[PDB]
Amino acid sequence: AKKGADLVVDSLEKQGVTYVFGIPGAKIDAVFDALADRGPELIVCRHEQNAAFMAAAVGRLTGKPGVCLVTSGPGASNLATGLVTATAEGDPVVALAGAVPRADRLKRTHQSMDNAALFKPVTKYSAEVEDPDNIPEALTNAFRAATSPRKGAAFVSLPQDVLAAPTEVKAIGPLPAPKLGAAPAEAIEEAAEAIKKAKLPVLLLGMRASSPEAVAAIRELLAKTSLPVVETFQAAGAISRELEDHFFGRVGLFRNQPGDLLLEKADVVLTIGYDPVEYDPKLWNKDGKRTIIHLDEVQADIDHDYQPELELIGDIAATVEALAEKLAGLELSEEAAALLEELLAKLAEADEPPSALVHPLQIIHALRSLIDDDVTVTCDVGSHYIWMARYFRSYEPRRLLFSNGMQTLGVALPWAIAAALVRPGEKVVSISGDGGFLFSAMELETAVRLKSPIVHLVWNDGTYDMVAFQQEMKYGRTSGVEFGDVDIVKYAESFGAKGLRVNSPEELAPVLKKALETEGPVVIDVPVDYSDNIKLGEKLL
Amino acid sequence: AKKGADLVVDSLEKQGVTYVFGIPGAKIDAVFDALADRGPELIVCRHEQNAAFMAAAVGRLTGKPGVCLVTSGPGASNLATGLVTATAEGDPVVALAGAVPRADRLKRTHQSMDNAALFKPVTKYSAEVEDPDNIPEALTNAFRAATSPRKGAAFVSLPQDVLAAPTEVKAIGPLPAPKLGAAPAEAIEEAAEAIKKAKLPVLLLGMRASSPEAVAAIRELLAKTSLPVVETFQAAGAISRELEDHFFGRVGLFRNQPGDLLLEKADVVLTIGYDPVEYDPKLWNKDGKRTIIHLDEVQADIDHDYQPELELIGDIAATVEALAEKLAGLELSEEAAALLEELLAKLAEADEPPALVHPLQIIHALRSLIDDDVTVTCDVGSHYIWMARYFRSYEPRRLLFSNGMQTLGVALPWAIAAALVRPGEKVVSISGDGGFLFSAMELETAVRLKSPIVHLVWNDGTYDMVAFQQEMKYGRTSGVEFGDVDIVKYAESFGAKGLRVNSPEELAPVLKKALETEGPVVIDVPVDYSDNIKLGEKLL
Amino acid sequence: AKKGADLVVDSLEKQGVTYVFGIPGAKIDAVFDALADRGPELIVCRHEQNAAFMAAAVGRLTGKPGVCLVTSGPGASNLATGLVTATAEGDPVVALAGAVPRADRLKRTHQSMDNAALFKPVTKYSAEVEDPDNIPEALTNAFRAATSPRKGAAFVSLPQDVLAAPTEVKAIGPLPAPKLGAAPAEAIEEAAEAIKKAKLPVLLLGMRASSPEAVAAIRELLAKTSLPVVETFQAAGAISRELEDHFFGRVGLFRNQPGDLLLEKADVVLTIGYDPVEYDPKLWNKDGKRTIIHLDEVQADIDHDYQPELELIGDIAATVEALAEKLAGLELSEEAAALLEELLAKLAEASALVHPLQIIHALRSLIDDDVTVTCDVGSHYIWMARYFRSYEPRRLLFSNGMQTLGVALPWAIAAALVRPGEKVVSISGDGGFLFSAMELETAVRLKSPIVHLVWNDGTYDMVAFQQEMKYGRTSGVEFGDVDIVKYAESFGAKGLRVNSPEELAPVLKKALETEGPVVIDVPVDYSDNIKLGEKLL
Ligand SMILES: Cc1ncc(C[n+]2csc(CCOP(=O)(O)OP(=O)(O)O)c2C)c(N)n1
Ligand SMILES: Cc1ncc(C[n+]2csc(CCOP(=O)(O)OP(=O)(O)O)c2C)c(N)n1
Ligand SMILES: Cc1ncc(C[n+]2csc(CCOP(=O)(O)OP(=O)(O)O)c2C)c(N)n1
Ligand SMILES: [Mg+2]
Ligand SMILES: [Mg+2]
Ligand SMILES: [Mg+2]
């Protein structure tokens, strides 16, 4: 006989799952025993939060779900943040959690909890299997749900006794969630005329635009047009070095960017793969003096300040390259040419440098200058994520990963561990702050164990700056943002990672190159100069 | 100056809502006051249940959401079944419910209840607005959610104080929910080859295949091919009288039909707009010796016994007429020609009738007396098995079933709505003795609207579907017998005309007079239910 | 061999469930087959809604859960309103519903639904059992949850295959949910002192005061004191004809009653079994600085205008009799005596159509204290709540927690089952009557000794006269006519009509003498209903 836990592993190996991020427990150790002989490799993590973070990173970089595996109760509830972040940022994840047996469901036993009810608000798919026979079906649809447009987390609760119960059904095959056609040809033609008749057409790329397939088709469009482009944070990597002329910056949390002015002067905006989570439409479209065209894999959500005049629902890559044929050779007006060149001048101006503290822009330029396009960069949340988002340039798809949907602390380091597994042989850079670093720093042990070729930069200010300089704006006074010091170099070494410090701005470029040449995980303490951070919230008008 | 309630009506005005089925209350009477001055016509209903039944009928027939409007607490909770039936059967509805004010939400006060949490398991979209400014956005997205593929119910809870609070925001224009392209051209080409290589290809049409646009593209294809089609109860209407040769019956609750045998012998099945709610794949694909091709607006759910080898997701109409081009002139094998002819004989044979009137002679009498411009609505029960498998409907959405939830009572409210969507047409409703009373209150609404309805009550004195299934499993019924209600008296309490068929010889006359009768009519039909156990027989 | 469904009936037998109001279906017919050979009697209903109303009535009248039994999907969802009403009005109910099998949970198949999630907002207990062995435990606790203080509805979803799966576990024996002690004796003494110092103390009885055990202890206290009392609608029946001197009306939906004044002039209010669902505290404790003492079986919920200075949590009957010993023989202030007498005087001051008061006085004069009277919701429920006096516990049942339409007639069928040999009177309006009128067939089937009065006005007056107050215009309240006599006779019940005010008393007496169900059409005069919401305070 073969039990339900066997049939979980079989399902996972039908999906081609190469790794599983887990922490074992009594209610789930059946599956961990099955994995001992066969199936995906098991990355033992040091907190379930980071196992979900790693699963989301796999989703972001491959487009197929990453997999975490945890036990009942506390193990399951430690996924909560990990899966909201996945779901909100379009990262496919399949979370597998144990549960008490079916007879103990309604009982007060150790670690009993309504797993499925908890994860309903934070997943595309939350379910508990109550028959071992249905495990193959539940998991296949969970994977398909996580991969289907508007990607996200699929949670499946597995009772201890169903995992141990015998079953004779086979695992379901690899059944790929399929792709769509392009938007209707009449709609694509309608959007084309609008763009041609426009005086300042602008492209707004969003979180779904930055997939390899979408980026290839978008670059194809930009090669054939004069079309200006602005990016949401997670759209990074769409334009290339070749097409950098089309790039007018990343529109962010405050409407104070050259990209925001460009969106205002537009009379026609083609949003591609645009999710409002990254940029509230009330920020850039308040007056409603623009035709919006919504190109996306799923219809739009209507805001007061987001009323698509047209929607091109279908495969972004298919619709855009159908639209490229219709827009090929479109040139811009001379008054648009003047406007765009002037904005590039402002864009290059803010990307210039200004104590033994290293200013954030010196970090960005030094690091960009030291890594090729074949290095993935992950980034935590904080003021450092504002600086990176608006000034660090990534020219190949999905080489600069941000948490801009839920903005959760700690993602950087686990994402980097996952990034190195997805992309072996490649260095990976992870950027965090002093506060968020401790949200996930436990996985430095997992990094050292995998010898992850990681270089983590901890920007040290001593405070939770993003929340602070916002508090200063609203109240003239921070509150609850200060914390004591931890020696980042000594911290790295307790884990057997290499720890370095940048005690001068003169010292930054040398420390980076030694760390990049260093084999195995490395953590660099960067005392950072946050004098200018309040300016990130300043207003243009 | 404008309050939140005004901005609800303005939103309804923007979606082109013609009617709103409502029952007022303290917490929602702001909106009922705004409807008094302008906006959709308000059909006062006699139970919130039937307002949601009608809302779903509007969605079934127009493809745009029907709207019900109810108050807090009891008004809201009486929508529950109406919204699960709408969601499970792809009927767009937007249910609007009042709630206690924001300051009273966490308090134990009259009619307080977590509206949004209650409807989460039973809707596409369950939300409570907590700012009057957000009303136009919440309702637009609720409407777009109901009409997004896999259509269903969108519930919006409306706190009293929000409806009364002022606001200056404008209503949001009609932002139509958009349609997809055809499935990728390489996938359509791949499906076409499989069908040409297939010894016996069969189409399985489902609940999404019976839309006007889908049906138009399906008929075009069948005009250009020799393709056999089997339908799920709610796929009714897809095949016209011209293409009736292609039709091999409706596959149902039991695997005992010629259409089931045809699905078995197929080596390639192209499912169009197929939702398994109507027919478990365990029931017709148990051996898994078929190429399944899933054509639909949304990807499939994987069963053990449903693993499509190809999926063509996209606008069904676009994908089908793309595929019609590739398959034009496809011919059957001569061994397929023989097989299908033999099955049509088995199909014609079962569709043959023997003081009670047999279910078949009802169907033949009724079909013979109503044109294709007459909508027919059916309740759930043994009558719904007879109607689903033996009443033929040849124009899209002229035979409405509850085959997703199998909810009792739907028939009569569905007819009241159907007559409002299609004025100047007769509407026939079919129910049994038990299900009629679930919804019989709305006969007052029908008389009020003078709905041109002709409601047939298949009278047996029991809940036969539950019984003959109980007899199959346990050799004994339990809790299926109930006392008799004079259907003719019942109709006349409400001011409707009541007729009874005392003899089979009297059926055709009684039908014709009822159809010529202006205003609602209820017909008591004493039926012969000796043969109903045979609907569940194992014949294969 | 024993299956899970057998073990569902065995559990019910252990709870002493006499009747089960149900509608069978494919997913639950296992239990309907088990119920065919033994155990609880099955009342076939004509809508699950009503099955839940009848179950709630059994809970209201016995204090032990009533039981309804339905199938998956539509059968389950037709309980929603029934169970939130029960839960809001403290009526113990155990709802049992079929569900698709455990392998088809996550499948898009007929009548599949998240039963447990749906009923979480509406019950004190919503669960699906996924192991037949766990059936006796899940039910026992469900029954105990429904009977537990702050009683309400417990929902149990039963997968079809679990019902069919073998099991050898036994059922669990009647597990009586237990009783509490009286509140701490220090707290009772503390409250007692506050009352003796008070110049005008007032009791506010609520929905948990009207249980038999509470009422007996309350009457004992009132016999030994000069305490004035005011009731919530569902507190009806607390005060006997002997102690009517203590009763100062039922505080209602508007703050315009003599009872609302005594509440204002009170310097101390001892609330007993008080649930704010019946009367929002902002209506009476709004303006003043009266000491609130919360006596109840569960702690209070803090309102801005309800901040008790003391709480006596525990068995209400034990607490009030302990407090009766501390307050025996306490007599009123002369300033309180004058006040009370004046407001008894304000109290007793209260066309072919019949005026609502004439109905109330005719009916009250015709029926004993051994006649249950149920009432629907509508303007008639205002007239009955304020002016129909009920002198024995739980003989006047109102839906004053959810205010759901249709409860009256099903409540009466259930009431006749729990109290056989007694006539039952049910009162409804033209609108609410059609919400539940189907069950007239069930009534005829059981020959329930019911007399149903339809106050026939032509509209939904409560909303109408409230709409008039707020907007000066009704909207959506008017509906066509139904012949209530012809309707009754469709079902084989007798139908009667009062064509004259002079004909009312005769037809009631003929209806009361008539055996089996009766529906009386009453054309009612609703001119004065606007005044129910008038200011007089
Ligand atoms: C899990 C989580 N906790 C808290 C926050 C709120 N938050 C956002 S940025 C921030 C400050 C982070 O400080 P640090 O990581 O040191 O970066 P800095 O802003 O100092 O550069 C906080 C507390 C969040 N978004 N997610
Ligand atoms: C709301 C609801 N309640 C109960 C059921 C279960 N059920 C399915 S068929 C049926 C019998 C219907 O009786 P009737 O309308 O007289 O039809 P018949 O089977 O006698 O033709 C019942 C109770 C259901 N499907 N929906
Ligand atoms: C199930 C339900 N539906 C609607 C309401 C709102 N409501 C409360 S009273 C009422 C009027 C009922 O009219 P009727 O029953 O005829 O009594 P009347 O006020 O006319 O005496 C309405 C619509 C409710 N509380 N519960
Ligand atoms: Mg910091
Ligand atoms: Mg019947
Ligand atoms: Mg009325």
Side-chain angles (χ1 to χ4, degrees), chain A residues 364-372 375 508-510 512-514 516:
Chain A
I364 287 168
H365 292 133
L367 175 69
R368 192 47 262 181
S369 148
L370 262 130
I371 76 178
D372 192 6
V375 175
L508 178 91
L512 283 186
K513 53 175 57 133
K514 186 178 158 67
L516 289 153

Side-chain angles (χ1 to χ4, degrees), chain C residues 107-333:
Chain C
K107 286 182 182 306
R108 287 191 57 90
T109 181
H110 273 142
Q111 296 186 354
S112 177
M113 182 184 357
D114 197 340
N115 289 352
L118 171 70
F119 287 105
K120 268 247 163 153
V122 173
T123 44
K124 35 190 317 173
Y125 182 106
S126 193
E128 194 156 67
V129 58
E130 314 282 5
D131 192 309
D133 292 10
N134 181 219
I135 282 164
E137 309 164 302
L139 284 183
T140 300
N141 293 281
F143 272 87
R144 321 229 314 172
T147 337
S148 187
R150 205 92 116 168
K151 347 176 119 240
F155 174 79
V156 152
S157 186
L158 296 165
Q160 182 177 29
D161 58 328
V162 169
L163 294 173
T167 190
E168 269 158 22
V169 298
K170 309 278 169 62
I172 292 170
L175 246 291
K179 157 202 169 180
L180 262 72
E186 320 145 280
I188 303 173
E189 187 65 38
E190 189 146 26
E193 295 312 302
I195 296 158
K196 295 189 288 204
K197 301 225 68 175
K199 296 286 134 76
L200 170 58
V202 185
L203 302 204
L204 199 180
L205 307 189
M207 43 168 318
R208 277 180 290 302
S210 45
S211 78
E213 299 82 352
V215 168
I218 294 277
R219 291 179 181 188
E220 201 77 63
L221 175 100
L222 293 187
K224 291 164 53 142
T225 64
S226 317
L227 255 299
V229 173
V230 57
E231 288 177 350
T232 77
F233 290 4
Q234 296 177 177
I239 279 139
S240 54
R241 296 200 210 245
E242 289 77 351
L243 300 113
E244 191 166 27
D245 321 84
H246 299 262
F247 179 42
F248 292 140
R250 304 223 186 88
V251 292
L253 329 181
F254 308 83
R255 206 253 191 160
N256 53 19
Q257 295 296 293
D260 293 319
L261 189 51
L262 196 66
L263 282 180
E264 192 173 71
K265 292 304 141 207
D267 62 344
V268 157
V269 194
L270 173 72
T271 37
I272 320 196
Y274 170 58
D275 207 68
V277 71
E278 283 189 279
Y279 197 53
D280 277 310
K282 84 230 173 184
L283 295 191
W284 60 285
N285 192 9
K286 12 66 75 206
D287 304 323
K289 195 141 257 209
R290 66 205 44 71
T291 285
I292 304 289
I293 278 55
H294 191 75
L295 204 165
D296 198 1
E297 303 172 299
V298 295
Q299 63 179 43
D301 289 20
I302 290 265
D303 212 67
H304 273 327
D305 308 305
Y306 193 89
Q307 298 184 42
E309 303 224 15
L310 216 81
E311 284 209 39
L312 306 190
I313 308 321
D315 183 33
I316 278 171
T319 310
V320 304
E321 144 191 1
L323 188 70
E325 294 315 9
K326 270 78 187 169
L327 298 198
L330 270 301
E331 268 145 38
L332 294 150
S333 188

